[model samples]
Target chain A: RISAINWNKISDDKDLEVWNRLTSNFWLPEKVPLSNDIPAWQTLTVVEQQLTMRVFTGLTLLDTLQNVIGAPSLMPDALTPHEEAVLSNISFMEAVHARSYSSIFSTLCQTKDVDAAYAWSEENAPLQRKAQIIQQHYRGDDPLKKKIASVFLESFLFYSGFWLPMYFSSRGKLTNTADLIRLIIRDEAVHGYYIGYKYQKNMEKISLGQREELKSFAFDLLLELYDNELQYTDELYAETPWADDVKAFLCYNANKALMNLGYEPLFPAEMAEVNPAILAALSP
Target chain B: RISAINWNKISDDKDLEVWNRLTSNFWLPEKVPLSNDIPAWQTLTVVEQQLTMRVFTGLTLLDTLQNVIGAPSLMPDALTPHEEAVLSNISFMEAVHARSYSSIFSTLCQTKDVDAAYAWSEENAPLQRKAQIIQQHYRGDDPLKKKIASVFLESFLFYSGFWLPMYFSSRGKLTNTADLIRLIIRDEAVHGYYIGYKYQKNMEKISLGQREELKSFAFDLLLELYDNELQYTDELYAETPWADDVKAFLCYNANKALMNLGYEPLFPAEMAEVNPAILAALSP
Candidate 1:
């Protein structure tokens, strides 16, 4: 799939509209006007604050890796104008998403709490391990394999981050973070769609061994990542009233992602607290 | 500098503001509202169209190579969170620049012209040569040389691309393409400053032998790339009146790049036509 990108002769224009809409609709984190969220932040119970802090802590790291690791890893293979536009915009949006977390943190939390989150991000072994997974396939001779990891990052790895806070946003739990999360979800829908497109295209041109390799990789990767998320979520949300809802929320988003790529849902269906605000953005 | 990235312990925050502003000020080409350029395209002579097409042709290739090849090569080595932000954004922006050319093409020229441009990109020996330069230093034990190449690509290589359209935008030419190019120049300014900062910082920690190595590498790379540009411009614009003006434009732009990175200017100070609109942009 990776070839010399002849920019002038566009072989495919499928993504042109997505590119246009994405670029035209570009917005900055600060411009989102999260100032109103400050009052809402004070209203949340201690558990809500912890939930918000923990969600952003995990999310910020994930966004950083996606922006830093996953996006650049995909760059070598993006050889068309459409691919460049989609990949670049997706990558840029990840940075924005990452900063939104910091923006939320700075405006709402004290220095010690923010510092603690950073400290947790550094010291936490599971997050470090997840970071390991992103870099694992970045190098080596197999382009398809790296792409599988890349797609997985887009489709599966980043979904939980979306729902963790988004479920709250949808429930009117934190409307201040709601707007930014809503926009981030919108940006991500396009990313997941494009990445899923890339994955499907990549799948169309693989050998039997490579296909088998991807299957096994997906199985192992998802298992470990899912298990990691379970522990990670439990660590943060175990005592909260929303704990069951978060697990269900994670499953619902993962199922939608699986369905988007034409895969059968792997997780059992669960009734997450439903809301229109985030779901409208999540749907392609 | 390509060490384990501990995201929490930010070793330095030198480029943090650049990273913030870059993320906050994101714009899409569509926001420039290029529908007007559709008519502007018809008014150009065969010469102006060729000049615009050719400049973009060369630039699109440069950016694609930079985005796909140079950015990936530089990514594994980014140590700090700030460095990661700066480098990834620069890489992402290159893809945007590449697509902006194609976007311009689809709007203004016929499919055949766009096809011709892509064909020229692939078959042209000079473009191939340039691609080789971007990839050559991507892998290797020596980190300093890669940083030098990265800086050169960001500052010198990208500046020429900006001024090519911008000169006209400045001089009441390509006023349609001008707005898009202004945003692009603004982007390149930050990219150049930060990459130059990286280059300078890398220089701060070099051994005597490494310093000498970087000096020769910079000289050779700049000479070859600029030499390639001179020939490329002449090949594209020889029959046009701007043929004489373009070389001076190239020199003026290159001189500014050299000065920005703490190096002396190489080309004799040639006065390109001064358009107040672009002159200020050209300065920094």
Candidate 2:
């Protein structure tokens, strides 16, 4: 029989700390006053309105994959039971994050408009390519390799969509929606850090040559996913003046994602700079 | 590519309502003041304290199974994406439920004593039998059969241990610990109801002969599990006077489990009785 988990006899304090922190940070979208953003949403131009819907739908797709597959698939490979438990919380919060976008749509837009964005998300090639890549790795055989994919998704892949609300909130619109997004961002912060910590720990048990190969693989995978993400950002932000700024923000988060895996930042500091207004908005 | 989940276009309103209800009721064990029970812990006899530890370990093992295997296994078989998301919440809450027991142990017991009870649960024959049987079904071929095993676990298997805290609370001891247990029981009520509802829904899609065979299998599985649970009850409660009362509570839950599957109750109303004082403790 599987042994019952004993919190009294914890083997690793990091796992305990992460579990406590994640559980302590537990929240739901309803806790935010999302309906208050309805007025702000109405003030946006039609182009901006359509952009927000598609951005959210893009986020909804990735969060759906993470909830349905990414986090759940990692549990079986957990180095400790406590780690597995932390992943369970992470998975559930992804569901909340996915549902939060829908909550925003319901409060801010008509049903037909919501349907149109979802249709766009379904047919969007760049979006599906990201999902397909992440899904493939989540279903892959190597556990540590999957963690690389997951860290990228958690810390790197989500920022394109995340930048929109932060941008809107930067301009004093959709501030409540950004409130809920911040909650999701906080959750993803721990998820990426915790999984990346586990990945580094597992690397310790391997030979130097093997670790080198894995590191190479991680960097290569990052470059590939980053290239795909550039295309995705271009498609989503091309019509707006925000395309270049969004790409820089993506590069900024991409470096943070690498740092999560114990690697040096991949981009030049100049290339990784985000808009000061967006940074200010996130600070609150 | 997997379609992004659109809360705008729901096919099953039950899944949506259940998801909303479950997420809204989100809680953490730390939210309850479990530390308040320290004085009550000092009042317990050594025997009473030891029994409480073992009972929680038993509950812990079952919750561990549900979190790690039971709920995760159901996701691949979900009839709807919304159903899968609800199962994700169920799985996460199972982790919460399992972790809550550890919270209780930490608050009330010494470290060595906590370790001893977890060890007891690992080797206990009847407890292992329950875990083994449930684990087998979670790994089984038929999704509906897994739901039967899951509902039984959610609704029936947990009560023997659940009764201990309630009984203690009835006597005005460890009341804060009982408070958390009540939260767990409330979650389980929804878990069993939702899974059983899903089971009955699936049953309508099959041939009558096939449905009868499945129903026969469920009743047989319940009988087999009940007989083993009787032995479990006797072993855990043999030193105290609560064995028969606990068995009655188990039978009461057994019938409720069947009813969750939309079947007739199995036991006589008289046979499925609980102590009024314990019931009152729970009512509070």
Candidate 3:
């Protein structure tokens, strides 16, 4: 079975095309200088500063976990070199995203504050539990169910920060930070779609019984993640006006992901559209 | 422990520099057109084509195993995000090499022979055990020593394929295939160096007792893989002289990797030199 890959003979050309696109689309965060956001960062109120620090501090951690676990999990059982290659690129890109958050944070916050955020993220049960759930399937050593867990991570778990900078930049705040996040969003958008495609395609081959099992598994994980997100938001955004708004953004992304994957939305997304003022502020 | 990466605060800037350089200096197999090799291949004798298929048939298998098993095994236990990022890129690149084999194969052979080669890789116990051995150390789940095992696999496998073109093409045998293998060799140099760095730095951490344990493990595994190659080559190229040349090259690659790791070479370098024809072929 190890040699089934005729590295000399391709099982699918389309997979290779996707991997190639990913390879060609690679970007380095350093290419976008943070000097663009340094002064913009100082203009924020203490509340905004804290949230800005909070979102990315959290994002770096999540990206780290996703890269470390997601890539290795998918590689071992991937059907072809193309699948493995794309997953491999996603792994490297996730590390880049983690570094980008760090790159932005360095110019915006003090080193001690950055250190504090990292230490805090480790203790954050919401994030830690999220990893535990993903690891359950990823290392459970079952490929069929591995993508199900990955769907949650790639599409929704990491998207919690997707719109944070967009909201600020769209409103003429931290516009430079928004620039870096925009790059991350675009890269992730493709990755989320790729992983979701794998699940959508693979899900068809499994039986109804397995489908029900996976649907239930997904909801169980999401219920915990949603609860965890609320608690985390409660703490991180305690006094900020933006806390509720960001939670709505999180809900919107999460719901879109669920519906897209043929599952029920776990959170209400009614306020998802309340942030257009910030969206228009985005340069790209 | 997985959550500890403060991408904002790197453990080592120099290592990150390596990752950045590697990511920036990216290449795709597509950049090297296989069509150049297509016409060159048809002019070859039956023995040459058969060996090409046999060697790469086995190489594709090794490349796949290394991609899926070798690199990912190190990531979860990486000491820093920089190291993890570097490992991630190498993992993806291995898959790229696997696909390159497929790309070359599609242009050279028919569907049935390709199918048979893929089938043969399974029944080939020597090849299967190599995978099993790698998965053993890698799956040993010991982060303290991933590079130790990875070094053994990359050098040997790359060694296994490097000569196919360097010797053959240098002698004006299969220069087109040599072009593609050159790309793979350059990529391996970076990966090989990174893994060697891990072994060099990490050798200090383990107790002398633990070092001995790891040394024995390395020697034992290499011996088995060494024997497996002998059996594997004897049967694959029973009619050709290339078999002896390839194994000597493999032995030399293995010896260098060991000495670089600061360990004794399993096989001495006395017989490492190959045929004058192959050497002349490699010379400009």
Candidates arranged by DockQ, highest first: 2, 3, 1
Best by lDDT: 2
Error of 2 at B152 (Å): 1.3
Error of 2 at A110 (Å): 1.9
DockQ of predicted candidate 1: 0.31
Q: Tens-digit lDDT track for model 1 on A1-284?
A: 12334545556665666667677667766777777778767778887776677667777877777776676667567645567657766776777777678777767787677676666767767667766776777765566566656555656656556665566565555665777877877777677776666766777777888777777776677677778867766676666665565566666666656655546678864454445565653442
DockQ of each: 0.31, 0.81, 0.45
- Using DockQ as the yardstick, the better of models 1 and 3 is 3
Best by TM-score: 2
In terms of docking quality, model 2 is high
Q: What TM-scores result for chain A when each predicted structure is judged separately against the true chain A?
A: 0.86, 0.98, 0.88
Give the count of colliding residue pairs in each prediction. 0, 0, 7
lDDT of 3 by residue, A1-284 (tens): 45535443346675766676777777777788777777777788877776677777788777877777766677666666567767877888888878788778767798876676777776777767776777777778568567666666666766566656787777677776777787777776676666667776778888999888878877777777777777777777677666677677777777766765677776655646547665564335
Candidate 2 local lDDT, residue B199: 93
lDDT by residue (tens digit), candidate 1, B103-141: 687778877766666666567665566667766776666
Clashing pairs in 1: none
